[PDB]
Ligand binder design. Structure first.
Ligand SMILES: CC(=O)CCCCn1c(=O)c2c(ncn2C)n(C)c1=O
Ligand SMILES: CC(=O)CCCCn1c(=O)c2c(ncn2C)n(C)c1=O
Ligand SMILES: CC(=O)CCCCn1c(=O)c2c(ncn2C)n(C)c1=O
Length: 570
């Protein structure tokens, strides 16, 4: 016989609650901005403006009692905890000695990071991505980059997810020595320093919390009160649409790998593995971890780091210790968690790790069969060829010979086949290796006809510097161009060359190029033909499948060719 409660929607945070507490309106240290709670804190204000208030309230979710407390006037705040994410029909009843009066039901949301409070994501995929019926046991992976939501304007709902088995989310940094990030310029290092305030060295953090969980995306139905927004909320709604898709955070990458060189000290590995565990308990849409250390032994961005004696065993110990940790998580959750890694495949990178040993702990190795040549020097070559190109010298392919000054080659040339064969030769099983495809070109300026030693092969020329171009043409950094930019501005609709470019294909190497004889612009990339060759190769060897770098740079053609190449290899 009290007055039935009316719920104050605006005074109760629009009934949006969450197991994870995320700062939405600042940028600060990771432990300050993100706190995961086993019980969500619920606070609901309700009013009984007329009649009698009564003396106690009970709260029901879908008919089940979940909280009780005292009413002592005409406005009450009910505070309680609840442990399960989801949407629920909430009623609040007020009671006195004579009876109870229940409010009308209203939906309350309790967010959790598995996306259990979210409907399947609405997609907006370019229709140039076709539908395939590829065997679901073949890996078809890609990297989605966190910063792609800015100038590249490529969001989670743009991904052709039904053509993917694995989404690797690039990248999760590690607090600590990070001079390589500083050297890149822009705001990357400053962002990282902020995220690491109050964080122990060697723990993972989110690099850009605005991209990850703050930015409101209209296409995803995000509102002011939505407790999780950003790319991560969209990946959560994506797992609701595609529950079998694996979404894996990739830790490291070329500029973020500095802290891995300190993993020869086991205390640093323990700190890092513990932070990864906490990370996967906090962000439950993720299905494992991808380790992208570029590179054990050195030769990467950090010119002053790398230990060819100790980094390999440290890498193998890291994989064992991660696998132990992921086994605990599988025990706690009943889920399967995957452990993978993207690796350099030049002989000098491979030789520093016993991968046959590492790989017993791992689900897959993503072999980085690209970046073999590029604008960091003026030597043209195929950056992603399967085999040795026509431009190579006698004995260069297998490393038997000498260069143009008579210097002996130090090892086999950089090709996908050389890398894959070296890994098989170590005893890595073919069905754990995933072959990489480039959705971008690397290129040079200045490779004009007078520099060529073979007048029909620009790979025999010499450059003056890196390819220059605008972001409109898909050039986001010097020397690098999106595949969709090469297609729009160099190849044209018929793949025969526009704007002063001509198309060529080195049939020996299985590698395409476009060349502008007058500017001497030369770009090496993967196209439909070379990606079919890769698919045939992967099929021949019984590899796990294919992956690509990076999804925002494709227009559909490369991922389509990945699927066609895997079907059609003979
Ligand atoms: C600038 C900010 O808000 C957080 C840091 C983002 C990190 N980041 C990039 O922004 C980026 C990038 N490459 C190109 N860009 C534009 N990398 C490698 C990166 O880590
Ligand atoms: C502006 C920008 O993004 C340049 C990044 C180059 C950093 N970097 C590498 O990533 C790298 C490398 N060797 C292998 N890798 C993967 N070196 C020598 C490098 O500087
Ligand atoms: C196949 C393999 O082992 C590649 C090793 C890294 C290639 N590479 C560079 O050498 C490099 C670079 N930037 C500057 N440099 C000198 N990047 C981005 C790179 O990938």
């Amino acid at each position: 016989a009290p007055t039935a409660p009316s719920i104050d929607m605006y005074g109760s945070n629009n009934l949006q609650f969450s197991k994870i507490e995320l700062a939405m309106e600042t940028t600060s240290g990771y432990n300050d901005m993100v706190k995961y709670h086993e019980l969500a804190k619920i606070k609901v204000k309700f009013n009984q403006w007329s009649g009698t208030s009564g003396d106690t309230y009970n709260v029901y979710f879908d008919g089940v009692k979940v909280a009780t407390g005292a009413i002592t006037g005409s406005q009450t705040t009910a505070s309680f905890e609840y442990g399960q994410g989801g949407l629920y029909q909430m009623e609040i009843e007020a009671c006195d000695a004579t009876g109870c009066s229940k409010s009308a039901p209203v939906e309350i949301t309790i967010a959790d990071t598995d996306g259990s409070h979210l409907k399947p994501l609405t997609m907006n995929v370019d229709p140039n991505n076709k539908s395939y019926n590829t065997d679901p046991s073949i890996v078809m992976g890609t990297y989605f980059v966190e910063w792609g939501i800015y100038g590249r304007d490529y969001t989670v709902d743009n991904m052709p997810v039904d053509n993917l088995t694995h989404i690797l989310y690039g990248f999760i940094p590690i607090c600590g020595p990070n001079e390589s990030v500083k050297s890149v310029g822009g705001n990357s290092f400053n962002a990282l320093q902020t995220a690491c305030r109050g964080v122990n060295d060697y723990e993972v953090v989110i690099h850009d919390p605005w991209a990850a969980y703050q930015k409101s995306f209209p296409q995803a139905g995000h509102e002011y009160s939505t407790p999780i927004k950003g790319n991560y909320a969209m990946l959560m709604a994506l797992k609701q649409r595609n529950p079998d898709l694996k979404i894996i955070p990739s830790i490291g990458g070329g500029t973020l790998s500095d802290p891995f060189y300190d993993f020869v000290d086991k205390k640093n590995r323990d700190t890092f593995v513990a932070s990864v565990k906490k990370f996967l308990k906090t962000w439950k849409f993720y299905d494992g971890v991808d380790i992208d250390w570029e590179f054990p032994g050195g030769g990467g961005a950090a010119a002053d780091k790398g230990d060819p004696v100790n980094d390999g065993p440290a890498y193998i110990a890291l994989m064992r210790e991660l696998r132990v940790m992921l086994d605990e998580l599988e025990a706690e959750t009943g889920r399967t968690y995957e452990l993978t890694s993207a690796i350099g495949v030049g002989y000098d990178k491979i030789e520093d790790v016993d991968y046959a040993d590492a790989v017993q702990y791992m689900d897959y190795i993503f072999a980085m069969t690209y970046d073999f040549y590029g604008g960091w020097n003026n030597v043209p070559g195929h950056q992603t060829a399967l085999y040795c190109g026509s431009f190579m010298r006698p004995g260069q392919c297998d490393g038997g010979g000498v260069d143009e000054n008579g210097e002996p080659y130090k090892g086999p040339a950089y090709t996908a086949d050389n890398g894959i064969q070296l890994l098989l030769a170590q005893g890595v099983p073919a069905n754990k290796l995933v072959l990489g495809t480039a959705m971008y070109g690397r290129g040079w300026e200045g490779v004009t006809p007078d520099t060529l030693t073979d007048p029909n092969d620009p790979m025999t020329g010499t450059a003056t510097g890196k390819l220059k171009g605008s972001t409109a043409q898909g050039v986001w950094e010097d020397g690098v161009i999106d595949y969709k930019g090469i297609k729009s501005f160099m190849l044209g609709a018929n793949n025969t060359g526009i704007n002063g470019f001509e198309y060529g294909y080195d049939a020996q190497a299985e590698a395409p190029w476009v060349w502008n004889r007058s500017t001497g612009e030369l770009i090496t990339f993967d196209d439909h033909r070379s990606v079919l060759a890769k698919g045939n190769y992967a099929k021949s060897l019984g590899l796990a499948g294919l992956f690509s770098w990076e999804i925002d740079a494709d227009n559909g053609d490369i991922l389509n060719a990945m699927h066609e190449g895997m079907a059609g290899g003979v």
